[PDB]
Design a binder for this molecule. Structure first.
Ligand SMILES: [Mn+2]
Ligand SMILES: [Mn+2]
Lengths: 137, 137
């Protein structure tokens, strides 16, 4: 039986700028770094950055919708998003609305998101305005 | 401040085989589906499958090391890996480390892993035998 996410590993092209992004800008906790990786945490999330020379930076328009969303509170959402925009972090666009979200890119083109709300809240919102063809179980 | 992982979204080329893989083979709970996606949960993890005409079925040699690891107990590890092997699920890497990991692919080539153990356990092992250039914080 699977019990949840154990860790998320992102391939990165240059370790130092990636560590700085996740630690200094996003405020995650840095536990360890070595010549080819780093371990960080964000609440319960174990994030691994792995140096990979096969990592390419693709424009968001030519990469798929795979993306990673981080939780933030209602009170902090707007000011954190504004801090990212003032730091010059690039944005990307999703094809549909999924509530209060801000979409941004990491230095290697990984698609990130700040989102306010749980799965339960999302399902309740979708019941009031469902996506096309929606069925609930 | 960020409090954890809110959701993981995987782009998929075809919804039906991906729902079959995550719900039926891996045992995740299906909460809702619509014409272009699905919401599942695995413990605390909120997983979204998003139908994307830009997603290609990608061989493991053509993608980088970015991957997603799910938690499982040591007692369930071997039987779960055997279930994946019976279903013909491809393996993309051999575990060459101490500790239990099984590296497998989803129908679109997303790189997945079963792993036993926490960040705290990994840090303790690394303190005893550090990687090259390792610094702790
Ligand atoms: Mn999202
Ligand atoms: Mn891993």
């Amino acid at each position: 039986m699977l019990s949840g996410l154990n860790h998320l590993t992102l391939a990165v092209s240059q370790l130092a700028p990636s560590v700085a992004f996740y630690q200094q800008l996003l405020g995650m906790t840095l536990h360890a770094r070595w010549d080819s990786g780093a371990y960080l945490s964000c609440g319960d999330l174990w994030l691994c950055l792995s140096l990979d020379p096969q990592r390419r930076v693709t424009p968001p328009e030519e990469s798929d919708y795979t993306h990673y969303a981080f939780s933030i509170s209602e009170a902090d959402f707007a000011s954190f998003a504004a801090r990212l925009e003032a730091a010059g972090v690039a944005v990307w666009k999703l094809n549909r609305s999924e509530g209060a979200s801000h979409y941004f890119l990491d230095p290697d083109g990984h698609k990130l998101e700040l989102h306010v709300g749980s799965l339960a809240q999302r399902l309740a919102a979708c019941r009031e305005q469902p996506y096309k063809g929606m069925v609930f179980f």
